[PDB]
């Protein structure tokens, strides 16, 4: 049966993973399916309670990785090998047996949500909570799912899918419609003006970016456009824009003014706006219209253990006007109808995890979350039918397991331009949280600044994230040399196809805390892989201080290495995987060096703290003995291989035929010097380094007219 409890142990393919499983912990393999590869786990208790905790078993001497909420809104990573190091509010746990990987997914069941936490005795406890004193249960059968396999990424995905088939209450990332903003450069007003944003500031930012040749095609009008008032917390007073967004003649005209300027005058395709899941930070001003009533956040133990300041946050103490569940659809619809009729294409929806703290006597955290998201999704589908929703501050399983439609999720805590501790931590967080969040939605690695000491560090990460790419530059503060590595002259980006994630290598070694390893992040394009390597040692969240701090490091520089197969799915980029020997052409985007890397050969990589390097990794095709080739792409862009749309080898003609998007310097590996390089039927000059095999030529202009991609032929 693979995964079983017998004696009082949890045994996984004949390895004891946990010992000392209580008698009252019960397992099953039924569901809709119903027979299922892993096991659902639950428990039976003596009394009704609105909260239970129960040990599942004792964990020692097995490497784990977990994603845990260090704050209400957000996860980060913690590695370890003893149950006692498992954090409070662990939402995802992956265990290694030394070859075999086991995932533990704590679930929502009925009105309860579960997570895991470690205790002093090295037990893994499941914590089940309804968040409502009137909602009480005593037995549970599907509050946790455990599944094992030999490919850690495949293991995760198969488990999520099994759970989906059981709950039917979410979709997987790959089944959802991504909104069109993901394929374009954007700009977000948040770090540029904070709440003092005005419509003139919006226009200024768009114009400055476009004037340097990297034009955004979406904008996020972030927090500060809405009509809010104090009663020191602010609450929503109406659904329309404030005075800063009213045309300065004609104050009857509203946010439609800036939207039309953006799109007709500056060429934007999309405009999004920010709002809280509750309207604003303090909710909506109490009243009949939407049934808003003052409510005060309930504290749960796990959240407040990791985040003690939450007990004295302004939202906790001054409360929120919570719109009624009976009127929530109407609130979202009236807000979104106003927005859509003004030309707005989507919303960035923040403050999402507050609902779990307000389910009071409304059925609790799960039911309240489900209700609000049901209404929000209906409103988004009606009013922003490109699927215009970015989920923000939303890392709770209550929202993840009801993620049926929305397709983009902020993968971490905010970019912080002025906080030096944050940069290394940001890269670790987005990468590790993406392992799990990217099963539900496309991860958004957040805005950044192009003029900043960490700009390249952040920029390169976004380029391999698989997610939307956007800066929050103040108008005029741009580095366009850096932005041209991310954005083409029409505002399109080279987006990779998957959530960027750590390599198998990096899943159980904490590169923020171990003092010894470099973080390596992989993604895929259609005909190449990509790999970024980061030193992010020297800072992380503190179990003792309970916030992000710097910590001692043994040295500045670390040396690790890369292999072609670190790009876990690199196979899928090969045009003939069954004959492929595993050799890759590896192009260092930062050094500009092409290296041939045979299957399993390592290359050493050395980096100091806050340094990085990006490598495009392309499968080599052996056309005949001595004639071998791999495309690289737009070598002056971070995610070079994202430019290759089509690739075909004709060994009988010793030819390669490609479809390439974009413009700039194009590169490929060839063992031999080409006879000819042809672009749309004309022959063009090229360079060839005989020593590395690097072929380069210039793609002068974007494709015009009926072309849409450059058609390139390379004759060898």
Numbering used by the authors: 5 to 102, 120 to 252, 265 to 749
Q: What does the publication say?
A:
The alkaline α-galactosidase AtAkαGal3 from Arabidopsis thaliana catalyzes the hydrolysis of α-d-galactose from galacto-oligosaccharides under alkaline conditions. Here, thin-layer chromatography is used to demonstrate that AtAkαGal3 exhibits a dual function and is capable of synthesizing stachyose using raffinose, instead of galactinol, as the galactose donor. The structure of AtAkαGal3 comprises three domains: an N-terminal domain with 13 antiparallel β-strands, a catalytic domain with an (α/β)8-barrel fold and a C-terminal domain composed of β-sheets that form two Greek-key motifs. A sequence comparison of AtAkαGal3 with acidic α-galactosidases further confirmed that Asp383 and Asp447 are presumably critical residues that serve as the nucleophile and the catalytic acid/base, respectively.
Interestingly, superposition of the two galactose moieties at the catalytic binding sites of the wild-type AtAkαGal3–galactose and D383A–galactose complex structures shows that the galactose moiety in the D383A mutant exhibits a chair form with a slight distortion; the O1 hydroxyl group at the C1 carbon is in an α-anomeric form. This particular structural form thus places the O1 hydroxyl group of the galactose in a position nearer the OD2 group of Asp447 to form a direct hydrogen-bond interaction with a distance of 2.87 Å. Except for O1 at the anomeric C atom, which exhibits a conformational alteration from a β-form to an α-form, the positions of the remaining C atoms and hydroxyl groups of galactose are conserved and make unchanged interactions around the catalytic site compared with the wild-type enzyme. In the D383A structure, two additional water molecules interacting with O1 and O6 of galactose help to stabilize the galactose moiety compared with the wild-type AtAkαGal3 structure. To confirm that these two residues, Asp383 and Asp447 in AtAkαGal3, play important roles in catalysis, we generated two single mutants D383A and D447A by replacing Asp383 and Asp447 with alanine by site-directed mutagenesis. The TLC results showed that the hydrolase activity of both mutants towards raffinose was abolished (data not shown).
